Write a sequence for this structure.
DNA sequence: AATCCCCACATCTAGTGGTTGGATAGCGTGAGCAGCCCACAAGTTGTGGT
DNA sequence: ACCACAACTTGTGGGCTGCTCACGCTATCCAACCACTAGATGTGGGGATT
């Protein structure tokens, strides 16, 4: 890990203190040339297993794209979509699991989206839940209306 | 057919083919005086006036793309989409108008859409009619129910 | 040219009256089956010859894209860009030439764009005229300021 | 390093490589208890806070793309762009901050930009500083002149 | 303006040949991960400091 | 609450073989454009309403 301050190769570890609550080792490293210290944290990569079966890293671009398609025409600014993507990623990482299932990403998305825009929420659910008849539409308006 | 280059009084057609659908015939006409050869397209008048008022030519690739998005995940193969594009283009040509507002190209889609797929119909309406809320999703479910 | 009303092949020409001022033959055609008449106009395809040397059909998408990149961040709605593209195409076709040179499309664009947005105009000219030093920037502000 | 799956107290590293630039080391750690193998990435903290406030990780592909657009048509090859990306990334890492607002990533580009190319500098400023009018194009030409 | 009757004929279709360019599969040659290996370089209790 | 320093040994990191995925190459197929010939057929005069 080249030193950030002087770009000299092979820095040397000083401390390697694993933290418990977070599963993140915190190693302080120091450079041989400049004699300075940089803190480095190591955290497990988030990944989502798809409906197909294979696994891929979590991207907020895909969350924001999916929400943006549903919000088409509605007064939702790009700032709100970015904030929603951030909230979804935070909620996903709060569980701490390394591998999550697209289905939970969807249940995490459907929380903030419902407060963001109702029509967007139903237009998102109609593709997420794979509606087939009209009956599902007023069924969903039922659950939304109950609140 | 005056030559566009030398403004010659008349010109001659080397090669003619009915190139698009049956809608247009494309000719290669050369000018005897200057021996330069130009291409030309003959077709019936069909110009969609957009929401802004900008007069833009009619294209099936833009009336299908707005339907492919609506029927997301539904068993509506590409053949059905091409068939619906054909049907809507024929329906809008048959009325014999040279200036068809784009507000009346949606109504030409809501007809065949109910037959094509019944949930995709509502999904197309949500963006086309800009449903402000869940209450309008219900009413559209109601009026459709009456048929 | 399949008849629009009944889609029967090989319609038959009735009149072929070339018009002078426009270089557009107007042929009225009639169908053998339905016995109805459709008017068809034939006009030379607009084409632009590029700086490379080859020729390509005129597209308003490319005009609007070029103007949109320059207008980035400025308060110019997409409606104004569509109207500007329409005006540019109208001005280009007013000359009546079949082949135009990208350079004139640029001089046609720089007319409406200057009234649309000054900063957009200079950011467009800086790429169109291929500026090399700062001196060009206040040189151009000179000509703009003279009006 | 607790296993994310079975919450085992400790785990072991099968394979380690310094994968990105010198910035990160990526390890493949397996759990002896459950024999499942997870990947992990270690790197220094660097998080750009965007204009909205959304904390997004630092990427050179987004600091070069905003410069490639500015130097449109100028003789600034891809090697120079990569070199400038390296220089700006190093300059922002060397300050040793874990939260660098994106308003201060532009200032880290305006430095090397003057050396790289002098018209591209002004073009980057027009969008970055949102010049409302031609008068501000002049002032920036003036302040640059003083250097 | 737009459209609508003739009639006769010059000419436009269209129906074959050639090219030529651009997709387009099937190849070959890269890229990655895994499974080894050991010792040196990293973790791991101790005492601390601010 | 990091941050520092101690020894030290267990551990990780690098270094080393294979493998599978992918992706960059090319000889072939269809499409488009040009050259060509005759005859339906599209034009180009001629009136004539709306
Ligand atoms: N890589 C990803 N990172 C984060 N969110 C993702 C990712 N891929 C998909 N998502 C989101 O999670 C949800 C997944 O729901 P969906 O029904 O589309 O499942 P899927 O596994 O993506 O389906 P498909 O079988 O088409 O891959 C969507 O809201 C989608 O935007
Ligand atoms: N140029 C076009 N050709 C054919 N259909 C079009 C064209 N433009 C729009 N449509 C169709 O017209 C319908 C009306 O929808 P829409 O409001 O999107 O029209 P629009 O002209 O694109 O206006 P807007 O600028 O508001 O999007 C849609 O189904 C759309 O596919
Ligand atoms: N096909 C096109 N139809 C209409 N406008 C076009 C077309 N191609 C380019 N233009 C526009 O005309 C102008 C051409 O100016 P420019 O200096 O870019 O020349 P160019 O011939 O496009 O250059 P290049 O050598 O990159 O092809 C631009 O405003 C561009 O948007
Ligand atoms: N995630 C990022 N990583 C690195 N540089 C970034 C990132 N986001 C923006 N920048 C850079 O920050 C500078 C500031 O410009 P800019 O206003 O576009 O920032 P921004 O975060 O994209 O905000 P905005 O939402 O207003 O576009 C630009 O030069 C841009 O390339
Ligand atoms: N046309 C649409 N209108 C509204 N919401 C939509 C639309 N299409 C998709 N969505 C929503 C519901 C889906 O669960 C979510 C993401 O679906 P999708 O478009 O398949 O992208 P994705 O992230 O799954 O891509 P990929 O399958 O390539 O990984 O977006
Ligand atoms: N994701 C979607 N889900 C449901 N319906 C949709 C979706 N996207 C488009 N539609 C419907 C409603 C819209 O009025 C119609 C076409 O919209 P739009 O994309 O604006 O038209 P367009 O592509 O023909 O024109 P333009 O590109 O000029 O906007 O299709
Ligand atoms: N970054 C930019 N900022 C402002 N105006 C720009 C920018 N890039 C290009 N332009 C303007 C000036 C150019 O004359 C015009 C079109 O240029 P360009 O981007 O080359 O597209 P184009 O239409 O020439 O594409 P093509 O070369 O593929 O045909 O747009
Ligand atoms: N066409 C252009 N001409 C001149 N300068 C430009 C152009 N496009 C971008 N820039 C400059 C000014 C902008 O502040 C900067 C980057 O802008 P931008 O594209 O918003 O950033 P980005 O791609 O890093 O982030 P984001 O995608 O989140 O908006 O580059
Ligand atoms: Zn160093
Ligand atoms: Zn001529
Ligand atoms: Zn007919
Ligand atoms: Zn485990």
């Amino acid at each position: 890990m080249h030193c950030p301050f002087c770009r000299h190769p092979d820095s040397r570890v000083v401390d390697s203190r694993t933290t418990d609550d977070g599963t993140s080792i915190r190693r302080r490293r120091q450079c041989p040339d400049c004699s300075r210290r940089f803190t480095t944290v190591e955290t497990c990569s988030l990944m989502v297993v798809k409906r197909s079966g294979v696994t891929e890293p979590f991207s907020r671009t895909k969350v924001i794209n999916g929400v943006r398609k549903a919000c088409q025409g509605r007064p939702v600014t790009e700032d709100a979509l970015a904030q929603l993507g951030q909230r979804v990623e935070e909620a996903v990482r709060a569980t701490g699991s390394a591998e999550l299932t697209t289905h939970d990403v969807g249940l995490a998305i459907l929380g903030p989206l419902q407060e963001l825009d109702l029509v967007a929420y139903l237009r998102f659910a109609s593709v997420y839940r794979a509606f087939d008849s009209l009956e599902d539409f007023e069924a969903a308006i039922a659950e939304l209306r109950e609140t």
